[PDB]
């Protein structure tokens, strides 16, 4: 099970790439 | 089962990260 | 399951990726 | 067992540092 | 199922390549 | 024995960076 | 089906293939 | 035996953080 | 149908290396 | 035997530390 | 059809050799 | 010998800052 | 056997510091 | 530890909500 | 765990409404 | 130990159910 | 987990919208 | 050592009924 | 999962309606 | 040694109290 | 799955097109 | 070297039923 | 599938034109 | 695919005269 | 408690500050 | 507390540098 | 609440510091 | 909220040093 | 928000440097 | 929008370095 | 746009080094 | 655009730099 | 077009180490 | 183009290592 | 012609580890 | 032609090398 | 041609290491 | 013989490695 | 005959290691 | 022979660090 | 003939590190 | 022939170093 | 020849940090 | 020449350390 | 808080009127 | 906070409006 | 804020008039 | 932005200007 | 911007006039 | 940008005519 | 850019004739 | 391009005349 | 290019001297 | 060099002493 | 060299008189 809590936390990883990314565009202009 | 609470604390710490993201986002604007 | 949670991250970590160069993109200009 | 309370350490670390990433959307507003 | 997403993935990737290629051009001139 | 009294440390090390975090947080407001 | 998504990731990567090269062109000049 | 008596002095020095980071709030009101 | 797909992404491969061999013609000079 | 007796004396600057914290408690309020 | 595309990736490559093998006598002067 | 003489300078050190904690309590009150 | 008249020479420091201590304290009443 | 997870997922729906008025606050703009 | 990953699709809905609003502001413009 | 997870647990509810009041007062603004 | 790639999709769809309104927006320029 | 534990666990049950009236006061404002 | 390959054709038309733009300045220019 | 810890569990469980009064004295607010 | 090589098509015939623009701008050079 | 250790187990219980008496006197307020 | 065979040879006859214009100016060196 | 044979007759075509312009150009030295 | 009077003490010598300004602007004419 | 009264007699000793440097423009005619 | 209180004197006390600058404009006339 | 009033500090502190480079400027002449 | 005036404050204090520069050519003339 | 602004900022701040130089060149003849 | 503006920043920032390379000349003769 | 500035701003550092090694010389004469 | 400024910059840092170069030799005189 | 400006940067810093060599030897002589 | 001017800075900077060379003989002598 | 002066640096390399080995066994004499 | 300066060159290159060798004799002694 | 005794220190460095261990184990309890 | 002096310097170097270990063993007492 | 006495050295510094381990031992009881 | 000296130095710095080791002794007791 | 001055400096440095450390016994003692 | 000086005078200073050491045994004493 | 004549300072401030050394003897005795 | 930045402005304009007259008036001298 | 920006605006063309008086007024000298 | 770089623009032109004057000035000399 | 550069351009003129009219003056000397 | 490089071009005249001028100053010496 | 070429030509021709009247004054010692 | 090569040639050909002075003024040493 | 090696030539030559110098002064001594 | 050829020459036979010179000098000790 | 074994011997018989000692002093506790 | 070893031998036979004697002290103990 903890396989899926990991692939969870992946997600959410990812997610957070996300955001630092569209942040990161954002400081850009 | 400690696999089991590391994966909860990965979970806390990636929502953390989107935490942290969010907050440099609004840094930057 | 675990593995089609982990392509999910996938996905969303292409994203952040186009994301991210589209902000090497805008930030070379 | 010593693994067991190192894990919830972590899941409280972590706590700690969602607390401090909204410190950081509060200050950053 | 796991290898269409990860096509999928690595369609969205190969997209990302584009736009880090074309930042190259633009970097480069 | 003496690594599970170092936990026990861990543990309320932890819950000193939670105040902490809440006094950053109250601070910052 | 999987395979047909591989090759347009193929045809994609390739095209990103092009534009670097392209760019190791105007680069080069 | 002196790494139980060090461990028993980190849970004390513990304890004085959370009392300091109390005091942290108390003050930062 | 996927071979087709290949061949074509082979193709612009070729194209591609084309382009590269033109720019080592042009950073040898 | 003299690591014992150090770690006596970190036990008891411990303590110190701790009415410290409550001076600096009993202080700001 | 496979082939044919194939035979025409296989001739835009020797074009790649050709143009290569130039580049090398060029360096070499 | 040295270091034990030492160590008990120590913790009648730590005993006159415990002292020193508990004055400064009464001076705060 | 310097090192230990020095010691015995920092045992009646610290006994002097705790004197002073307790000084403090009966003047902080 | 299934209360742990609900609450995660609790966590979760409540930044779904905040994100949700964010949108339709960035909507009235 | 489907708390967890329906409260996921939450997220990224509200992120997809989000990019929406952006989308039609920068249309707007 | 269970009663440290339940504790938790009690944490992370309380911790939506601000985030659930700073939802409502974001909809009210 | 269809509502996890129904939100992908309407990512993507929003991605799709702001490349249209950027292309529209250099064609006017 | 199990008396620790559970004084942690009332610690922590403490601090989620402080969240917990900070949670109701700010529903209250 | 159909919509996810139709929006990757919206992106690679916005990406055409892109480069077609860029087209039309650089035969401007 | 164990009445070292059965000391350091009184001490938590009468910081434990003093939050549970600290509770109640701001659910009386 | 069409559409994605119809887009494919017509992001080939842009770069056709820029080529073809650049051709023009050397021979006007 | 066990007398010293008993009375650090008779300090922290005098330390104890001071905080036990000092959350009976916050009790009554 | 034709059109992208038909943008093959019209990227390709774009690369003979720019050989072309290269093989003039070339001429006039 | 009578395009395809055509682009690469116009290929070598342009190779020819480049050639033919270098050796001339060799033939003036 | 001793802090609460001296910041009463330290009100009230602001407000003779206060004074003795306006004694010093009245003075100044 | 006394962090308060403190904030309440900074606040008094400004409006008494006001005054005061009222009284300097005043003087300095 | 303290900290706000501050920011007011801080406020105060940069107007103050405005008339000071005001005043030693007036002095150097 | 407190950084936004400290902002204000910061505005009108700037504001004094314009008048204090004025005021330089002026003793200079 | 409190980056925007920051930025402000930044504004002016650049301005007032640039004062003081003025003011450094006009002193040492 | 905040590192638009910063960058006026940076832009003033380049104008006062220069302005220092000039007055550097005037202080040194 | 803010790298546009930056660059401007070092543009003339390079244009004070150049004055004050100019002064260290001046002073050295 | 912004290589383009940065190259500009490299060249004068440059052109700096001569006169910073200029300097060197005419100092050590 | 930026790498032949760079370019530039770097034939003008190669003159500025040249001419440090002689005041090493002139300064070792 | 710009490889051969490199290579006369090359040649000119190949010409400062000479004069840094001569510099060494007439140093260490 | 690029690798003849190289080779010309390769001659240049054998020359150059020549007399460091002989550098380093007389500095070793 | 490149590969003679290649072969001449060559040469002159190897007298640096004979030189540096002559200065090794200057400097261990 | 260039061969037989490449074996000159590996002459001095293995007199080079003749002289090292003697350099390890000259040392080792 | 160099062998022989080289075992013998091998033997030792044996020895040490097994009461390093016994003071891993004795340190870690 | 080094290698036989070096191998009593292993035996000696591997007594301290049995010297240190033991230093270990009683420091960690 | 320069290894003989470099040997020689090898022992006596083993010797020393015998001593130091002593003193470490001395140090730690 | 430089080793042979540099071997006895070697000697009288590990004699060096005997007496210092002796007095770490002495100096510990 | 400096390397041999060189060694004969370090001669008499470790001779100072003896010297030292025997100032070192004699002062602790 | 610079060497040989150098060489001389780090003789001399190592002769005069043999006379400092032997002051510092005798104000030892 | 400068070296030589900095070296001939550093022989005669070798010297004065000598000198200096000996008034340590000197007075210390 | 808006009445605090529109004070600001009008503050800011005051001060733009201020240095527009004194502008003119150098004008008019 | 448009208004601020304004401001600013104004401030900045009265300085010009002051260099092009202070620019008007050393051309007439 | 197109008018804060339009008056930037105002600025230097400024800047540049004045270096002309200078110019012209020096010239005149 | 284009006022920018051009201000640029007529700083970087008068600049030219002022290295001319020096180099003139210089000439005349 | 080729106003920039003109400038850059009308600079770098200017240095080599000054040049020419130093130069043909060292001749008459 | 030949203009830049150029002047670095007659920047470099400055530089050996400075070499050559060097060299000439040389001659002459 | 043969300008460039010629200068490089003038240059060497003044280092030479440095070299050439140097040579004949050690001839009359 | 020929002037280059012919400079390299004289270089060479002018190397081979201050080593056969000093192959004549090291035959005087 | 047989200039260059011929100072190798010249190279080695001066080097070859200088040894015949070194060796005549070994031969007389 | 027998007489160095002999020593090692009687070395380690002189630590088994010590350990035989150290082993019947923990069999008398 | 073989009184250097037999004084080796020689204090290694001390040391191990030392190590005997410290036996005998711990026995009688």
Do not use: G, T
Not at 3 to 28: F, G, P, R, T
């Amino acid at each position: 099970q903890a396989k899926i809590l990991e692939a969870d936390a992946e997600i959410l990883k990812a997610y957070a790439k996300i955001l630092e990314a569209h942040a990161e565009i954002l400081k850009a202009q």
